[PDB]
Amino acid sequence: TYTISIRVYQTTPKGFFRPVERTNWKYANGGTWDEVRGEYVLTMGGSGTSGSLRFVSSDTDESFVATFGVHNYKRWCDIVTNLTNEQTALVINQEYYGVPIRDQARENQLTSYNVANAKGRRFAIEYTVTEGDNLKANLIIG
Template sequence: MSYTITVQVYQTKTNAFFHLAESTVFRNGTWDEVKGAQVLTIGASGTSGSLRFVADTGENFIVTLGVHNYKPWGDIVTKLDPASQTGVVITPEYYETEWGGTQKKERVDARWKTLSSYEVTRDGRKYSFNFTVTSGNNLKVNVVIG
């Protein structure tokens, strides 16, 4: 069963401008932009995609969103090393090596938690996501950069 996750991104502070720098998928999916939203299409439960944002101030973060055991989930990683922590590196860390991932314990644990909302504050900036539609095959989520 395939899923779409429509992502609306909101920036609530004007002291930095974040732009989308990278979009990645772990197995069997694509990202598109539709009417200003980022839309992840995945082939089945058990995969995800990440969006990496970079600000004109050098701040950066990745939000990863997916479906695990037929439930939506997400995670946010902040304070990335831009040379070594890209979406291509981070996204597979959510999956065990036997599934083709690179398995980093705290990321695998985040996937298993199947959080439908989460927020983290780093250096005075709040990053959050909240799934507004959590059932069915057409999921919706808001990402807020504060």
């Protein structure tokens, strides 16, 4: 069993990103999302699955999906931004298992990732615990 505990840091009081969706991919006996002491906790039944969090800033028409999981017994992450209305977390989470551009991100098994949207706002995931069954990450909204 794996857990990834995520601390969300929203660093800029221009716009406001709120949580809107949390998904579990179906491999590795699935998984769950829990809120624990102000943190998001993704629990997974084995290696080879993932879960996604979508955040939306309605004030500024910005959004992103942050995905966390374990691939071949190593943690991975990705961020997708500049979303169309059709790119829910349900959509994006599932794309990591069959869409080549997404598969490759997962296969990279990254301990950290940062991306900017069209407006220049940066978003980052940084794992603070990178090994073992109980992983930890900061999700940083610039």
